[PDB]
Each structure stands twice: as structure tokens, then as C-alpha cells.
Design a protein around this ligand. Sequence first.
Ligand SMILES: *[C@@H]1O[C@H](CO)[C@@H](O[C@@H]2O[C@H](CO)[C@@H](O)[C@H](O)[C@H]2NC(C)=O)[C@H](O)[C@H]1NC(C)=O
Ligand code: NAG
Lengths: 48, 49
Amino acid sequence: SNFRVSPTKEVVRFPNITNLCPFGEVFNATTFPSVYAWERTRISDCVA
Amino acid sequence: SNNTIAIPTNFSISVTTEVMPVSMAKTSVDCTMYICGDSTECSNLLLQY
Ligand SMILES: *[C@@H]1O[C@H](CO)[C@@H](O[C@@H]2O[C@H](CO)[C@@H](O)[C@H](O)[C@H]2NC(C)=O)[C@H](O)[C@H]1NC(C)=O
Ligand SMILES: *[C@@H]1O[C@H](CO)[C@@H](O)[C@H](O)[C@H]1NC(C)=O
């Protein structure tokens, strides 16, 4: 079997986009949609 | 007919080929590597089997 090798180092690699997502704006809009007319928005190129 | 017999007057030497299996491929399974890959977390659950 194998008990020889166990990982110890961790290689974490992510796209280097650093712009934080606009949640503070999306959530704090002065008004939201009426549920019958709910609105869909793309969230992209950001860190959630 | 109750009173006649056929006798061979000649013969043929024949060579015939009989093919027989005797072994199969020896196989081995690392049951941990097959089930869990390398993931430590799954290997801990596999111990519970
Ligand atoms: C069995 O038959 C074979 C032929 O099928 C005989 O062999 C032949 O014999 C004659 C006379 O001796 C030759 O002219 C041929 O050339 C032979 N042919 C071959 C292929 O060998 C054979 O003699 C027979 N056996 C007996 C015991 O009579
Ligand atoms: C929402 O935005 C307005 C204007 O930027 C600000 O005055 C208010 O405090 C914000 N509310 C929250 C909960 O972030």
C-alpha cells in the first residue's frame, strides 16, 4: 500500500483579481425590486 | 451386412493442434488508492469499513 508519503506543503493558486464584490452596494440599495418584478444581475470579476 | 467387414488398407499420420489456456494475468489492486485516491479524509472514512 502507501504510508510512505504524506503532503505537508499546500499550493493555493487563484486568479489575481483583487477587486472586492459590490455586495455593500447591491445589498444597501435605497430600494429593492418588488418580488413580482425581481431583478437579476451578473456579479463578475470580483472577490466575494 | 452380417457377413462383411471393412479393413483399412492404408493409413495417414496426422498432426493435430490442441490449444489450451493455462494461466491468466496476475492482477493486484491497491484498494485504498482505488477508492480514496490520495485524499486523507476519505481514507479515514474508509477505515470505518
Ligand atoms: C497409402 O497411400 C499412399 C498415397 O496416398 C501411398 O504412397 C504412394 O505409393 C506409390 C507406390 O509406392 C508411390 O508411387 C507414390 O508416390 C506414393 N505417394 C506418396 C504421397 O507417398 C502408400 O504406398 C500407401 N500405403 C500403403 C501401405 O500401401
Ligand atoms: C447605505 O448607503 C448610504 C449612502 O451611501 C449610507 O448613508 C447608509 O449608511 C448605508 N447603509 C448601510 C446599512 O450600509
